[PDB]
Design a protein around this nucleic acid. Structure first.
Lengths: 64, 68
DNA sequence: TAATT
DNA sequence: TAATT
DNA sequence: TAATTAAT
DNA sequence: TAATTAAT
């Protein structure tokens, strides 16, 4: 289906631009490079206050 | 520790975006996300997929070849 | 770039 | 330590 | 003593 | 398109 494959290419194309918004947001919200954010992120997941402050978040993230 | 605070809300709101992405998947192609990801790996590695966009497929192969 | 200096 | 690397 | 993607 | 021990 080409009339539906054309839709599929756009759908993932936009959701790519959103992670870019996250990258821009992280840079302008924390004055940090976008990946050092993720370096300490998985470390703080394995801390009891992280699983107490927001359970579903750390649950999904630790699941990786 | 207030940086830790707003980071939690940040990933929380972008977790909701992932949730919005899941619902967008379920109501645009009538497809569960699991089979959606079961075919995504079978389509990105195609000659036509690489041809349409040079950066998209390259990022997809590079990042998963580094995470795994 | 990214903890490490 | 503290911008600078 | 339950849960959950994921496997087969 | 569901099932099921079994894994983590």
């Amino acid at each position: 289906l080409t009339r539906r494959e054309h839709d599929i290419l756009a759908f993932e194309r936009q959701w790519w631009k959103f992670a870019g918004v996250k990258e821009e947001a992280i840079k302008e919200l924390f004055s940090m490079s976008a990946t050092r954010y993720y370096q300490v992120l998985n470390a703080l997941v394995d801390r009891p206050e992280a699983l107490a402050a927001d359970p579903m978040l750390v649950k999904r993230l630790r699941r990786l």
